[PDB]
Structure 1
Amino acid sequence: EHVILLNAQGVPTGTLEKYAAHTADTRLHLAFSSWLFNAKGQLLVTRRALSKKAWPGVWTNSVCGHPQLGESNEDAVIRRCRYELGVEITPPESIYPDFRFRATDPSGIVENEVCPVFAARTTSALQINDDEVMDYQWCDLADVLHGIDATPWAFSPWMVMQATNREARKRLSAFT
Structure 2
Amino acid sequence: EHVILLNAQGVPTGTLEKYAAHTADTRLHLAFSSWLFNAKGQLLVTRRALSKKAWPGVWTNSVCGHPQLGESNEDAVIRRCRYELGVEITPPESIYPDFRFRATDPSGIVENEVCPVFAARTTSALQINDDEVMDYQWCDLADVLHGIDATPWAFSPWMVMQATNREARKRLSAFTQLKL
TM-score bracket for the superposition, by shorter chain length: over 0.9
Q: Show CA shifts across 1:44-83 (max 9, x none).
A: 0000000000000000000000001121010000000000
| Equivalent position SS for 2:174 | coil
The worse-fitting range, judged by mean Cα deviation, of 127-136 and 4-13 is: 4-13
Q: TM-score, normalised by structure 2?
A: 0.97
Aligned length: 176
**Distance (Å, rounded) in 1 between the aligned partners of 2:151 and 2:63:** 21
Q: How well do the aligned residues superpose, as a CA RMSD in angstroms?
A: 0.5
- Per the TM alignment, residue 166 of structure 1 is displaced from its structure 2 partner at its CA by 0.8
Q: Show CA shifts across 1:19-48 (max 9, x none).
A: 111101111000000000000000000000
Do structure 1's residue 22 and structure 2's residue 50 form an aligned pair?
no
Would you identify which runs of 4 or more consecutive aligned residues in structure 1 move more than 3 Å?
none
Q: TM-score, normalised by structure 1?
A: 0.99
Q: Show CA shifts across 1:124-155 (max 9, x none).
A: 00001000000000000000000111110000
| Equivalent position SS for 1:173 | helix
| Equivalent position SS for 1:5 | strand
- Per the TM alignment, residue 9 of structure 1 is displaced from its structure 2 partner at its CA by 1.8
Q: Show CA shifts across 1:79-113 (max 9, x none).
A: 00000000000010011000001010000100000
* Runs of 5+ unmatched residues, structure 1: none
- Per the TM alignment, residue 2 of structure 1 is displaced from its structure 2 partner at its CA by 0.3
| Equivalent position SS for 2:169 | helix
